[PDB]
Design a binder for these strands. Structure first.
Lengths: 98, 108, 105, 93, 79, 93, 98, 84
DNA sequence: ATCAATATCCACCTGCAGATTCTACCAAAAGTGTATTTGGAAACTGCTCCATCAAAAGGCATGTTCAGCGGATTCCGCTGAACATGCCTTTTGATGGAGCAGTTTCCAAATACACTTTTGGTAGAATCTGCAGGTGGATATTGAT
DNA sequence: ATCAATATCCACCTGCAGATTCTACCAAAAGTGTATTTGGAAACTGCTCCATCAAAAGGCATGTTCAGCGGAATCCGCTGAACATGCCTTTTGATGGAGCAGTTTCCAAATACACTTTTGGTAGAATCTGCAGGTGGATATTGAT
């Protein structure tokens, strides 16, 4: 039979998405998240089409960046598996640390 | 009986007149030397020029003749001084530079 | 006459704050309320830091607040710390804190 | 003459605690503090007005600014005082 | 159940674009947490602009301005 | 209405890449760029003027502003480009 | 003869210097370094004492901050000895790397 | 007029050591000292380059604490206790 | 290395979603004349910044000695990546319907503006005291035996 | 486990640097009386946002198998910590010289209106194409053998 060794498809996935630019979170779900959160601040709100796109674009770019720093923190620890504490350190050093 | 665009006088393509209007709309009691909007119109055109310069080259390398956001992120993130000037900026649908840490590479 | 500060029932200087709003060309006009409000806020935030610093001073058995006290007051209060996050206080020092793993057995 | 908030900070200091004093180095910080926030708020307020194509900074802009700049709880009490003051002011004559 | 809609497959896609090879199982919820705080902070300010403007509609700009002041300048939505 | 730098971005583009065009979104980014740098430069400028108790933003401020905001090499050419345009604007009838 | 174990004195200092607030770098040596750099930038400059003082307050606070972030990085790699690569990770995540 | 040179070496190991202790560091790699001077040197050239630009903009031959204060701010590092 | 299962890159072609271009009001930039402000000029006062100097003790530099840290090597239990599987749901394209942005236009409350009067700050000086620096001694911590 | 070596906690002592009142000059707040105009208020239009509907193929959740990674444990080479020594250099503190930062005032070059004529920029409709997407065979990559 056939089967790809652990981490090969991942490396391939990396090379892939790292070459493209389309969003990676599902639109509908995101839009639901936005409106959900937005509510707790102001009721009966109306988002423009663009204001949601912009919101998501920012978010994904944010996470994609955070994952880069997190990857550095894993590698720093002789690992290659990003664990939650890599995200903590990364954000701690960033000044976010929430 | 003729009119002459300050931009033409400055030998620039950007809106010298519009710039002055803008510098004022955004900074009240400050008087504005006629030099101000010309100097800036020129500086922005220059930086604009500089970005397009490399965006294209990037569009070219991508076997394409149409500059798109990607071509701009590439042109910016690969250039030291621009990438510096644009830290804290996110280019809609610009992607990320292709980069994989060797520690993660297969092995060969 | 009566001072606008007195009228708004404030210690901070409303007129002064008003004047600066102008010198600083933040805009064209300045609502008669703006400098009162701002003045009010600045005085409030001032009171807050002063409150915690005073305590900090007395905690260290001291009658006079120094920079290290503003430092301790500020760095121990979640919110003030956030507001003054990119700030550095001359002669303030730092919160004493040793990483746990660095302590002996 | 160089003006500063010394006497004003001192007034507030004496209310929070009557028997406490403040070093000139500490008063310095206090000054820097007041000036910094004064800047942050006025600035934010300024932009706010321009985003809304307005030509006037009013107590209303100052408040939103205070909202955008300050940490939740500090913000709340901040906005009380603000209003409390503007309101009182608007009747003291 | 919004904030689960942000699926593991997606998060993985993200991390991938971020050059990530392996992923703790706990990462998923964690990222999920981080993303929530992110939007809370930017939307809150965005809505605050929308509010101050006496509007019931959050505009692209509201977001742009909110982002700006958070240090995260964003391009392509000033239109 | 709704103005932009769209058309100028375009001229500049063609002026150096006749056989190349730019997409909608791509153009919006360039637009953002111009608006941002513009703002940063205008911000530093008025600020220099303020610190120096001046009431006029002049090419001198814009320049300093430019020096303070741009990385070395990039800054070099902008200073040149600027003074160049102001000189020709002054002489040129 | 008496002699403390390695670390005992170090922790002693950490406590000591974290409780105090005085500048840790020698004044004069610092003033020169500042004038050196300033001169190798623009000649014939004068400095008000406070500017030099301002620069040192700023310079020392900055490094103390860097050392904390540097210290977190070492601990992350299960080490207690800060190393150049530690300072390097922290500066990158900080966005300093220029 | 005594020429100034290699004054970074004035930022001595003992000093870089106290700073790190206040930073809460217990163990220091031997390569840290030089590494730190490098980092310090960049920080200073940056703050000073801006400060002096302010100085020169105001056609002045003296670097004032405000020049430094404004300089530290452009860099997002606000400093209290020197604001004139 | 030798297949062998498979992903990947490149040759190749065409309808059209999206970029490019045409087109004609028109808001705003260019223009001439007049009114108001300013920031460089210049003589000049005086703060403070520079460079000394002399005494000397705090602090740096060098060397040594060895504790324990960092890292290398080994060992395995189990956490996650690869892959097939059954299917819930996001995606998609046009729709009438109203909330609701964004325009035009009138006007009363609020700002600006130019003096005059009154006084709350500031700089300097006489004056009150918090605490930094030293001396000492009981106490807590550390490290050897 | 007890004990010598030391750093630490710290109550008392008190002279003096730095903080706190004490008072009159002066920008600058604060009244008043015009003068100007924002921007909320009211009527209105249409650029968009929420939505009801309904397929279908694109992904998500599920679950099974195990590869190999993260993490614990043993270990020893040598890098840094502690430290005793030696003596240089930063520190301290008083002292003069002078460059230069800052105040002040005379002034022409320059920016700010107020207003009219001429486009430069934009909207949206008419024209146009770069390439996304589909097909297909060559080749590269991966992995068991």
């Amino acid at each position: 039979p056939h089967r790809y060794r652990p981490g090969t498809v991942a490396l391939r996935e990396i090379r892939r998405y790292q070459k493209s630019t389309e969003l990676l979170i599902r639109k509908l779900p995101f839009q639901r998240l936005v409106r959900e959160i937005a509510q707790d601040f102001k009721t009966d709100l109306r988002f423009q089409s663009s204001a949601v796109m912009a919101l998501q674009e920012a978010s994904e770019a944010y996470l994609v960046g955070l994952f880069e720093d997190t990857n550095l923190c894993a590698i720093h620890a002789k690992r290659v598996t990003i664990m939650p504490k890599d995200i903590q350190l990364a954000r701690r050093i960033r000044g976010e640390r929430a | 009986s003729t009119k002459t665009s300050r931009s033409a006088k400055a030998g620039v393509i950007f809106p010298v007149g519009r710039m002055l209007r803008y510098i004022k709309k955004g900074h009240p009691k400050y008087r504005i030397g006629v030099g101000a909007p010309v100097y800036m119109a020129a500086v922005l055109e220059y930086l604009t020029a500089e970005i397009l310069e490399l965006a294209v080259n990037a569009a070219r390398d991508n076997k394409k003749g149409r500059v798109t956001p990607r071509h701009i992120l590439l042109a910016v993130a690969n250039d030291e001084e621009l990438n510096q000037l644009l830290k804290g900026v996110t280019i809609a649908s610009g992607g990320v530079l292709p980069n994989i840490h060797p520690e993660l590479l297969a092995k060969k | 006459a009566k001072t606008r500060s007195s009228r708004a029932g404030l210690q901070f200087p409303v007129g002064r704050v008003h004047r600066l709003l102008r010198k600083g060309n933040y805009s064209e006009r300045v609502g008669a309320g703006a400098p009162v409000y701002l003045a009010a806020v600045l005085e409030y935030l001032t009171a807050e830091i002063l409150e915690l610093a005073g305590n900090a001073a007395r905690d260290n058995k001291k009658t006079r607040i120094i920079p290290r006290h503003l430092q301790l007051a500020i760095r121990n209060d979640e919110e003030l710390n956030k507001l003054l996050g990119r700030v550095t206080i001359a002669q303030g020092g730092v919160l004493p804190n040793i990483q746990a793993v660095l302590l002996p057995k | 003459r160089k003006e500063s908030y010394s006497i004003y900070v001192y007034k507030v200091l004496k209310q929070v605690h009557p028997d406490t004093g403040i070093s000139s180095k500490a008063m310095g910080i206090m000054n820097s503090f007041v000036n910094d926030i004064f800047e942050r708020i006025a600035s934010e307020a300024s932009r706010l007005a321009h985003y809304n194509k307005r030509s006037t900074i009013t107590s209303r802009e100052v408040q939103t600014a205070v909202r955008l700049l300050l940490p939740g709880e500090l913000a709340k009490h901040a906005v009380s005082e603000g209003t409390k003051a503007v309101t009182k002011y608007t009747s003291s004559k | 159940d919004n904030i689960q809609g942000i699926t593991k497959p997606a998060i993985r896609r993200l991390a991938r674009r971020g050059g990530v090879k392996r992923i703790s199982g706990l990462i998923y919820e964690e990222t999920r947490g981080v993303l929530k705080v992110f939007l809370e902070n930017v939307i809150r300010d965005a809505v605050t602009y929308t509010e101050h403007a006496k509007r019931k509609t959050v505009t692209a700009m509201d977001v742009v301005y909110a982002l700006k002041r958070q240090g995260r300048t964003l391009y392509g939505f000033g239109g």
